[PDB]
Amino acid sequence: MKTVIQDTADVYFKRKSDGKLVFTAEAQTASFSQAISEEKLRGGIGNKPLYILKSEKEINLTVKNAFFDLEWLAMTQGETIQEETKVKVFDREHGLIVDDTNKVTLKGKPVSDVTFYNKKGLTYKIAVSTDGTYTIPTAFAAAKDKLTAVYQIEKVGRRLAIKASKFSERYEVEYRTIAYNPDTEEVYSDIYIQFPNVSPSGEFEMSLENGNALAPEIKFEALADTDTDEMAVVIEASRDE
Amino acid sequence: MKTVIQDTADVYFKRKSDGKLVFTAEAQTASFSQAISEEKLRGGIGNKPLYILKSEKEINLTVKNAFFDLEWLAMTQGETIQEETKVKVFDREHGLIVDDTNKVTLKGKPVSDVTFYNKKGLTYKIAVSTDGTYTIPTAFAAAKDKLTAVYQIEKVGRRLAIKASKFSERYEVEYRTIAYNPDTEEVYSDIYIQFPNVSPSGEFEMSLENGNALAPEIKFEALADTDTDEMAVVIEASRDE
Amino acid sequence: MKTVIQDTADVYFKRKSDGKLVFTAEAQTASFSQAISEEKLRGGIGNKPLYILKSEKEINLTVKNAFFDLEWLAMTQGETIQEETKVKVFDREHGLIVDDTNKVTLKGKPVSDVTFYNKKGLTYKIAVSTDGTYTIPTAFAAAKDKLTAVYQIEKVGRRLAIKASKFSERYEVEYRTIAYNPDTEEVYSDIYIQFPNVSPSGEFEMSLENGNALAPEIKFEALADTDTDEMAVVIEASRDE
Amino acid sequence: MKTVIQDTADVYFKRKSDGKLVFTAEAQTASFSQAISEEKLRGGIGNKPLYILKSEKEINLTVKNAFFDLEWLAMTQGETIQEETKVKVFDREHGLIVDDTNKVTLKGKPVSDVTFYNKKGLTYKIAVSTDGTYTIPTAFAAAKDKLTAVYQIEKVGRRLAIKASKFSERYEVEYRTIAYNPDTEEVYSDIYIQFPNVSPSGEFEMSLENGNALAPEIKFEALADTDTDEMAVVIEASRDE
Amino acid sequence: MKTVIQDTADVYFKRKSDGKLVFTAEAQTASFSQAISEEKLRGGIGNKPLYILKSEKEINLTVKNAFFDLEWLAMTQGETIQEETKVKVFDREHGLIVDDTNKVTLKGKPVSDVTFYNKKGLTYKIAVSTDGTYTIPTAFAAAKDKLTAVYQIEKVGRRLAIKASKFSERYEVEYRTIAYNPDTEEVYSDIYIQFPNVSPSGEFEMSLENGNALAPEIKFEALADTDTDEMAVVIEASRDE
Amino acid sequence: MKTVIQDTADVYFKRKSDGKLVFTAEAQTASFSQAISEEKLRGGIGNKPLYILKSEKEINLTVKNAFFDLEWLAMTQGETIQEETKVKVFDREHGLIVDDTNKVTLKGKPVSDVTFYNKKGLTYKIAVSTDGTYTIPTAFAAAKDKLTAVYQIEKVGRRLAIKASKFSERYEVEYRTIAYNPDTEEVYSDIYIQFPNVSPSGEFEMSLENGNALAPEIKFEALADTDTDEMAVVIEASRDE
Amino acid sequence: MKTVIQDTADVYFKRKSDGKLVFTAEAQTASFSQAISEEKLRGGIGNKPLYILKSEKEINLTVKNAFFDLEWLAMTQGETIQEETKVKVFDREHGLIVDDTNKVTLKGKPVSDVTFYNKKGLTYKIAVSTDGTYTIPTAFAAAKDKLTAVYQIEKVGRRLAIKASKFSERYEVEYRTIAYNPDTEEVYSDIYIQFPNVSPSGEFEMSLENGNALAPEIKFEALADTDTDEMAVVIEASRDE
Amino acid sequence: MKTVIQDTADVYFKRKSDGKLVFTAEAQTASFSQAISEEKLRGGIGNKPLYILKSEKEINLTVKNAFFDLEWLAMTQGETIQEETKVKVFDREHGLIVDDTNKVTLKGKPVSDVTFYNKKGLTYKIAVSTDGTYTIPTAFAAAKDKLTAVYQIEKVGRRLAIKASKFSERYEVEYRTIAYNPDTEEVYSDIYIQFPNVSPSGEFEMSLENGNALAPEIKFEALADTDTDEMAVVIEASRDE
């Protein structure tokens, strides 16, 4: 019976090392693609084909969500997130007014060497002062001027490390979607697609566009189950259960 | 006479072994492509080619429909759709309330472990309780909290299997489209593009995106016929004869 | 908890030799991408164990701004910016009128020879005259006609030479962005991406087309740190801690 | 400082062979690109990237004007335009009336074979007639019908021949543009880019579309100077000096 | 000399196909608004305009009448008015009182079913009431209540179908205006804005607004006649004849 | 100083080719506009507005008089008034009474087919009767009725043609107005707005409405001067000097 | 608390360099509007909209006065008033009684060609001389008849200059309005609206009609400040307490 | 049944982040609008026939008050109001009489600069004088005259900052209104409209006309709830309960 599919799929992930379950109900794209190649045998005067050898197969999976979480990034690297880490980040203060004594006051807690910029693009590089007041040369900026400061601070958070010697883990995936009857407009069937023995391929892109959304990508490549030689199964149920 | 084409084509199939005329008249795209490659032999002082050798042709077919059928994906593979098979799928139930005596009531019928998710993110693996209720611990959710449950259940339906198997059966594809007269507007002729020996290959792509129009995509490669040494025939049949 | 990221990160560049700080709070695009090398351990029935061989990791960075700064040009070609340098540039004059005695007046200060063009299109090349008035041949121009003049003048300003010597130095790069709470659209956390050992790369396209802004684009590419074996660090710092 | 560029550039070409200078004040695209061959050194466990190998620094130039001028595309192809030459061109005549004697009369001076087309799309292949009168076959058309004709004529004009020949001519190129101050909306700087020792590499591309401007394109390749190992210089001149 | 005009043009429409004439009546509004669309070509610094590529013109007409006639909708559609066509409409019979035995009669010659509405708005659909009796159930209404009845009858009259394709029958418009002497204040000239080969355009609007006249409006687009290119002609006459 | 303006008009046009100063007259409306294409450059977190890109500065002109003159239609389309051209116009006559012999006598001079309208809506199209008497068909009407006739006649007068070709005439325009001092309500300043190098464009619009004297509308477009690069000049005078 | 506003606002303008101050105390309208870009984030089964995904922001200002000040046009175009400049203007004279002996006495000081117009309306381009009376061509008019003349004079005053390439600078704007207590009707608070870093926008309409005042209109677009990221400040202060 | 509504609605706002309730009792307009968008899937051959797909709904809310309150536009831009803050405002005195010498006094506390204007219109800037006396050049104005002064002062009040990187939060809304009866005219029902999960879109327009009341306007955009899949609910009632 011909159907019409118009939604995305609910995607279920399972880890074949411990038994974790990661699910997504806000998917934006769920796709799977196939590829097959064959070889032919030829010989004799005129390399006419004499046989058709075995055809090989490969299957790829792509999943794109509409949210962001660090678990999707931890999946593609195989490295555990570390809670409560002390990191060193950058910070910037704008609109600082010098006094007639050529001194500015910093409201932050500078850690590294402080950098000062003025309205012409010149740079000053001055170490951390104890009392928060610095001395600025008269050639840099005159009294009643505007300066900006850049420095570093300590913060607390979570950490994920993208190393060069960590590609890990093997998963199992399921897709679920619905299919409609094209005559009475009612939902007719539920379609399930099962992939056992998949491996996460390293193809990552984080584009922080102007506006827009993130929509992370995750990509898998399918293998064959050892017990029963299957790579993907498609089940078309019905509303007769 | 020069004409105008502004519509898609019907994509009749027919297997050679046994007559199974597969029909589709609600197509969205039908495309045909040709490429030619060539090799040469080099020579003496000037590296000029001497004589031609090993020139080949290759014709590729692409069909994109608008509806969806499981007998359209069984053509790329070589397996068969096994009716009436009992399978295992995931299931999800949102919004379970924990009562005063730290218990939750389950409305489904699991055939595996039950995974519970709280409002920030966590896991709890418990086994099937024949009574129907489950005792959530105290450190997970206290009372008047909303939890999510994920199971595995059983269902009956059609079941395909994408294996690495032998694809043998060859088909006879034929397209049909009508052409219009630019001067006065009525049909002038019908255009047929009959491929005489085609072999399932190339690739497949199922992209489930959150809009609509799944548009299943299939490709084929046309090989030279044995008796007539043909690959594709283009026919223009006028409506005046 | 899942969040929504709709913004462009602020970028910070720091040279690892001295510590020059160049930042941008006006960026339009900031992205990084990953790549890996994949192959299969396969062959057929004999090599039934199929396994994915993963090797080699690539991390690339691209930043697109909206203003123009010459420090970005100086970064990709390691060379200090010469300042207050006398140079020679072209300058043209339009709409000059020939007098009765075939003598035109130039109000510029030429250095090289002077080239004169007429309205139909020719060229007269003459040397420099001290008083600033040049004789004109009778055939090339007539009385009360229109001419234009081109020469070279002297100007001062900055300079930066592109030599056939590859750049040097390595940069620490930081991206900073923010994430939003889904259910109640308030700011939840700040996300930092850090690259500790990253080299620039030469991929420039400085296209100046009419009616469009410049939007410079710079490309970096990452190498492993020699101690921690890292290439990038992703930090998610909550705003309530 | 951080300037804004929102306009194209005026270009200047000077030939180093004799003396010539050609400029543009109407260009539509001025582009300058750099390409460098980069490979990686791979090491121990995980095939980590450690060092980058750079070579082959090349610079290319792209100029697209708004007018069509035969002297400008003669730079990218080394030849000379032979003015005032006779040549053979194609000609087409429409709307011919045939009398009752199956006779047709042409106007013009054909030099080659005459081809006739009817209203259905058939071809007639009559040779040249001395008095410009032809006798169409009865089956081709009847009285009070309409036919069109194709033949060849001779014309006088210019002529440029594209061959396989070495040009070996050198130029000096200069680009000039203006740059505004973002917080005062006044012109702040003039930006010059200088290329000595350029050569006209041949990558011509000409596309004529349906109702669209042509914008001819010419490409150049910049080579290193043999006196100060420079390939391009960048100059920023402030109007306050 | 300085004609004053203070009236509305008396309009006449004529058709090419057969030549019937309409609008022997009084109008309210007439216009012939004219427009030109231009395309630019820009280049150089500042995007100065160089040359144009438009060569286009258009003329539009709008006529508004204070009366109603079915032919004014026949010119906005590609169809003819069919006459003596029996058609089905809706009638009504308001006012019914439920008695003890529920026996009330309807007058007329109904064809379709009758619907009855009470205070609670219950439908209680019944078939054709062949006699003048129909029952009422208790939950519908009590004794001595008020009901309203609706049904469908047949009528004979003129008809005008509206289809979704095809338009023909170019028209000729003449704005018969009258000019008055500025001094005498009596007819000085007779303005005859004639317009050959106009085409109807479908921008119809029909709204009824509680007692005000409908005042239908018709729109036209004027084209060059065949060869003379006289899309609009303005004629001034005199009373001196 | 601040002044109050209540009057208008005093508009002068002067031709550039020949000296023709037109309508030293009192008008109704005389406007003056300005348009600039502005686009916004955005970047950073939140896509903040930070610069405005401005170009394509244009100025238009609008004049509306109080009388209708064909000398003012000639400044929009370049086409000379073809004076004394015989033209074909329409004419209707009312109050025709049917006699007892089915005869209708026309006192006019018909030159085309005549159309008769009855009291109900029957249209009778008949050819020109040279005897001055018309035969009345029996089915058209009965005796002692009122009939209307419509036919074509010829007349003599002026004629202007609207084409779609060329406009190459230039003018200089000046506006004069009066401004009063607010504290005295006496005449203080004369304001002159002068536009050099104007060009007529076609944007005509005249609506003939009932009971309303029209205002013919004429539009122009100002263009940049060749030597002064000025579009409009605003001049304020003083009555005390 | 709750206030009632029924008045306009006093408007103050200040230039951000050489802070020229222009204020108005007789205004008619002071408004400002805000706009943002909206979208939707969707996903999952169905297309349920998840969140809003807000975007770029815009603020526009409009001021409408009741007097005429030349400085408003001088801030629409980034130019300066040039005081005490001598220019040429037009002049007209009616009521010229034609004196006998072919003389007409003048009363002004013509500087250019004098043009004469007769009763029926015709031209006559004479030239210039100290002829209190010129010499009439009896061909034109007769003695004791009417004549009108038009010529030019010289007058000194202020002037502006609208150039083809001019900016609009940047400004700070302030609106002041009063608020009322709704229970007792006494002035409670003063509301200030401060717009820093705004730019004038050129869309100027200046229509002069028959007794309609002039009512100027000026428009601004607001851009964010670099230091505080502020686009508008709304203060309720100056409360009489 | 059929009810007549002649009243406005009372509005309640509820912030789902801190538990803040905002209540309106003096409203003028409460509007609620709804739109449905549907796209259709099309097949091939001949025409492109149809199939109806799933549709989407959008709901908008609009509220208008009668009193001005700073909390209303504090929700469009989510940002708190800081109390008792120092601000700089403009001020001016009129009617200053110059002294006998040539000096004037000011009974205020200027901050930045004083810009004197005279009765004819001019400008004389001078820095702040500590003695409270200012000297004017005699050419600017003379003694026994009147001048005006404009400057800045400092004040203390409440303050709202409209920033370019801050949007609103999530809210819940309810409208209440009263219906009538068309026969007994007493009262029939209370109509409630409830909107969960709304978001205030920024479509802001506050204008200050002369002698016209100010009514602030607020807009919203409905989003479906995460539990009931609902956008807005309409609740009827009755007075008989």
**What is the widest separation between alpha-carbon atoms in chain H?**
99
Beta strands in H164-232 (DSSP E): 171-178, 190-199, 203-209, 217-222
In 3D space, the residue among A186, A195, A207 whose CA is nearest the CA of residue A62 turns out to be A195
Chains B and F touch (3+ CB pairs under 8 A): no
List subunits contacting chain G, requiring 3 or more Cβ pairs under 8 Å: A, B, C, D, F, H
CB environment D165-201: b (16+ within 10 A), e (fewer): eeeeeebebbbbbbbbebbebeebbbbbbbbbbbebe
* Residue H141 in tokens: 């104005």
The residue among H42, H40, H77 whose CA lies nearest residue H204 is H77
CB contact under 8 A, B212 and H54: yes
Q: Are C197 and C177 in contact (CB under 8 A)?
A: no
Are A232 and A195 in contact by the 8 Å Cβ rule? The answer is: yes
Give the gyration radius of chain D's Cα atoms. 29
Distance from the Cα of C211 to chain E's closest Cα (Å) equals: 7
What lies within 8 Å, CB to CB, of C206 at 6+ separation is: C214, C216, D31, D32, D33
Are H32 and H198 a contacting pair, CB within 8 Å? no
**How far is residue F136's CA from residue A117's CA, in Å, rounded to a whole number?**
102
Nearest chain A Cα to H52, which residue? A185
* E strand or H helix that includes residue C193: strand C187-201
Distance CA A21, CA B122 (A): 10
Technique used to solve these coordinates: cryo-EM
Helices (H) and strands (E) in chain E, counts: 1, 14
Phi, psi angle pair for G134, to nearest 5°: -80, -155
One-letter amino acid for residue F139 of the chain = A
Bridge partners of D135, per DSSP, are D103
DSSP state of G125: B
Identify the helix (H) or strand (E) that includes residue D134. strand D133-135
User: How many Cα atoms sit within 13 Å of H73 on the Cβ side?
Assistant: 23
Supply the DSSP symbol for B6.
-
Q: How far is the C-alpha of B105 from the C-alpha of B119, rounded, in Å?
A: 18
**What's the full length of chain E, in residues?**
241
The structure tokens 């200047």 sit at D12
Q: How many CB atoms lie within 10 A of CB H214?
A: 19
Of the candidates B96, B190, B184, B111, the residue with the CA atom closest to the CA atom of residue B147:
B96
C172 and C16 Cβ atoms separated by less than 8 Å: yes
Closest CA to D4 of D135, D184, D200: D184
DSSP string across chain F: --BEE-----EEEEESSS--EEEEE--SEEEEEEEEEEEEEEETTTTEEEEEEEEEEEEEEEEE-SSB-TTTTTTTS------SEEEEEEEEEEEEE--TTSEEE--S---S-EEEE-SSS-EEEE---TTSEEEPPTTT--SS-EEEEEEEEEEEEEEEEE-S------EEEEEEEEEE-TTT-SEEEEEEEEEEEEEE------EEETT-----EEEEEE---SSS-EEEEEEE--TT-
CB proximity F41 to H under 8 Å: no
Q: Burial level of H192, CB count in 10 A (0-12/13-18/19+)?
A: middle
Report the residue of C4, C7, C67 to disrupt the G interface, i.e. the one with the largest count of G CBs within 10 Å. Answer: C4
- Alpha-carbon distance of G183 to F201, in angstroms, equals 60
CB atoms within 10 A of CB G157: 19
Opening angle at CA D202, ends D200 and D205, nearest 5:
120
Q: How far is C142 from chain A (nearest CA, A)?
A: 50
Task: Please state, in angstroms and rounded to a whole number, the distance separating the CA atoms of residues G67 and H97.
Answer: 26
| Neighbour-count burial of F116, counting CB atoms closer than 10 A to its CB (0-12 exposed, 13-18 middle, 19+ buried) | buried
- Which of H206, H91, H158 lies closest to G191 in space, CA to CA? H158
How many angstroms separate the CA atoms of A11 and A218, rounded? 12
CB F174 within 8 A of CB F109: no
Q: Is residue D170 within 8 Å of D196, Cβ to Cβ? A: no
* Residue where the block lists tokens 């042409």: D106
Gap from D102 CA to chain B (nearest CA, Å): 23
Measuring CA to CA, how many Å separate F27 from each of B237, F68, F199, F205, G209? 71, 12, 20, 17, 9
Sign, CA torsion H38/H39/H41/H46: positive
Pairwise CB contact (< 8 Å): G59 & H203 = no
| Tokens found for residue G188 | 């409670």
The rounded distance, in Å, linking the Cα atoms of A215 and A66 is 5
Which two structure tokens, joined as six digits, stand for E217? Answer: 């409006």
Chain H residues lying within 8 Å of C183, measured CB to CB = 16, 170, 226
SS3 B240: coil
Q: Which chains touch D (3 or more CB pairs under 8 A)?
A: A, B, C, E, F, G
Helix (H, G, I), strand (E, B) or coil at C73: helix
Distance, in Å, from the CA atom of H147 to the CA atom of G229, rounded to the nearest integer, reads 38
By CB neighbour count within 10 A (0-12 exposed, 13-18 middle, 19+ buried), where does D82 fall?
exposed
Separation of alpha carbons B68 and B212, rounded Å: 12
G57-76 per-residue burial string, b: 16 or more CB within 10 A, e: under 16? bbbbbebbbbbbbbebbbbb
- Give the closest residue to H109 by CA, choosing from H149, H58, H55: H149
CA distance B55 to H18: 76
Q: Which residues pair with C104 in a beta bridge?
A: C134
DSSP structural state of residue A212: S
Buried b (16+ CB within 10 A) or exposed e, E76-97: bbbeeeeeeeeeeeebebeebe
Tell me whether chains A and G touch (3+ CB pairs under 8 A). yes
Which chain A residues are closer than 8 Å to C177 by Cβ?
A: 208
Q: Is the CB of residue A192 less than 8 Å from the CB of residue A28? A: no
- Whether residue E157 contacts residue E125, with contact meaning beta carbons closer than 8 Å, is answered with no
Helix or strand (DSSP H, E) at B11:
none
CB B85 within 8 A of CB B157: yes
Residues in CB range of A131: below 8 A, 6 or more apart: none
The answer to whether the CB atoms of D8 and E45 lie below 8 A apart is yes
Q: Which helix (H) or strand (E) holds B35?
A: strand B27-40
- Helix (H) or strand (E) holding G182, with range, is none
**Local structure of C192: helix, strand or coil:** strand
d(CA C32, CA C219): 10
Please list, in sequence order, all residues whose beta carbon lies within 8 angstroms of the beta carbon of residue G16, skipping any fewer than 6 positions away.
D184, G169, G170, G171, G172, G197
d(CA H67, CA H27): 9
Of G167, G168, G226, Cβ closest to residue D183:
G226
Copy the structure tokens of residue G11. 């408007």
Which chain D positions have a beta carbon within 8 Å of G16's beta carbon?
184
| Alpha-carbon span B78 to A36, nearest angstrom | 13
Whether residues F2 and G213 touch (CB distance < 8 A) is answered with: no
Cβ(B222)–Cβ(B195) below 8 Å: yes
**DSSP 8-state class, residue E74:** H
Helical ranges in G62-191 per DSSP H: 70-76
